[PDB]
């Protein structure tokens, strides 16, 4: 049943054409969302609670509709490459077309988690049953590509990914894991990412 749905799901992904995400142009600076209580951007609030060292952004009109069901991306640079890093991704994580409806980011005044991981990226599901549509999961991909790309050629360096997540040779910022899973290469999430 599920190798089936997996192939379902893997060779849907490969029909569709290379997407593209309009970038976000009015789009706060780093300084900006370390201060933002409670503050709109880009249909995405920001907060920036004592309560924890992360700054919080959140679609309000969710793209996918359902649960967070455990999937989560890193990006990981290094600790004095962070806010650049911000400016340089802004873009891309405030896009209306960007499939992340949830992230956060350290906020590198409030930290002793700052030498790498310091970007999280939520995937939450759009289907039912807790379910992936192969064009989320498309989306997804050509987002971590995109990523990727923006920052390699901007010559950031990678930080320091946690032991706990798995990547590819070919991700140099980007690094995966699911929350469910304390063999997590075998995720069917994950192999709809890199294979």
Same mark, same amino acid.
């Given at each position: 049943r599920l190798k089936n749905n997996f192939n379902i799901l893997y060779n849907q992904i490969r029909q569709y054409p290379a997407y593209?995400?309009? /970038?976000?142009?009015? &789009?706060?600076?780093?300084?900006?969302?370390?201060?933002?209580?409670? /503050?709109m951007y880009q249909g995405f609030q920001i907060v920036n609670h004592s309560g924890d060292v992360f700054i919080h952004a959140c679609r309000e009109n969710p793209q996918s509709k359902g649960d967070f069901v455990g999937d989560k991306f890193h990006i990981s640079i290094a600790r004095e490459q962070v806010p650049l890093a911000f400016q340089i991704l802004s873009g891309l994580l405030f896009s209306e077309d960007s499939?992340?409806? !949830?992230? !956060?980011?350290?906020?590198?005044?409030?930290?002793?988690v700052g030498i790498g991981a310091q970007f999280t990226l939520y995937v939450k599901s759009d289907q039912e049953c807790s379910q992936y549509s192969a064009l989320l999961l498309h989306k997804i991909r050509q987002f971590i590509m995109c990523l990727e790309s923006?920052?390699?050629?901007? !010559?950031?360096?990678?930080?320091?990914?946690?032991?706990?997540? &798995?990547?590819?040779?070919?991700? !140099?910022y980007v690094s995966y894991r699911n929350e469910l899973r304390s063999m997590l290469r075998e995720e069917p999430f994950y192999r709809l990412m890199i294979e």
């Open positions: 593209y995400f309009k /970038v976000a142009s009015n &789009v706060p600076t780093y300084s900006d969302i370390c201060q933002s209580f409670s /503050v499939p992340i409806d !949830k992230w !956060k980011i350290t906020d590198m005044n409030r930290v002793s923006n920052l390699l050629r901007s !010559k950031i360096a990678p930080g320091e990914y946690p032991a706990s997540d &798995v990547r590819p040779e070919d991700w !140099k």
